[PDB]
Amino acid sequence: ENALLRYLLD
Amino acid sequence: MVPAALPQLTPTLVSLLEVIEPEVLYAGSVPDSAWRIMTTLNMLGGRQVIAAVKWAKAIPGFRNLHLDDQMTLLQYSWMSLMVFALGWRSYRQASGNLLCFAPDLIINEQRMTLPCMYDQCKHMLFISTELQRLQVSYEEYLCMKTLLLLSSVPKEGLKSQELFDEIRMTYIKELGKAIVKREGNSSQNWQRFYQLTKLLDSMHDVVENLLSYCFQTFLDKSMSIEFPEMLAEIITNQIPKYSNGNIKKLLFHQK
């Protein structure tokens, strides 16, 4: 659902 | 003539904000069409939002909030962050008279007054005029922009509520320090702090006008306005929260 944002934050 | 060196940090929040501030991006001939301009703006906006996510990760305390809080804060504040920085560039580069999206993408008075640009551009430029009116300094701006990241929250509160309040109050105090540094008297300091916090509160209303365009142009695929992946994902996730009344705007003043 929030893959790109989550990836960036990780 | 001076040797190369990185600027000297000091143990203050504003010094760190100055070093972590992303460089202004270039969009990389302006269209005579509102439809084409909007798509171009969105493509630039996706790149700016990625830069802002990286900036947020570096803000002292941010990364210590629950991951869900971090994602939510960025989803709820991205527009405010983008519009505020657009306001700053427009203020510094054009005295609030032209929309300065990027050094290579300035939207002039004629284009800002095309039929389908008029309303959105008036709202996008308003904050720049306020920055110009108040003669906001770079340090004040940096503190205010961080406060915007921390100004739109879930109605039910964040998972790391206590920490969030602590972080937010550090930046409110930091804004006070930036004003105090001007060397005005106590009364002037109180007045300016009230004015700048009023300006922050006013961002919620400008942003409501702009999110209405953003969501409608995103949802109506037939309008053929394009959005990059980053923005599409965020907007897709933000809409249901916004429309469900879940985005609570923190206000310093009544309202």
Ligand SMILES: C[C@@H]1C[C@H]2[C@@H]3CCC4=CC(=O)C=C[C@]4(C)[C@@]3(F)[C@@H](O)C[C@]2(C)[C@@]1(O)C(=O)CO
């Ligand atoms: C009026 C809205 C508000 C606009 C946004 C205002 C804030 C902003 C500042 C920038 O420096 C680059 C892009 C953005 C982030 C933006 F300009 C574009 O995304 C286009 C945008 C959503 C909008 O023009 C549209 O909805 C077009 O579809």
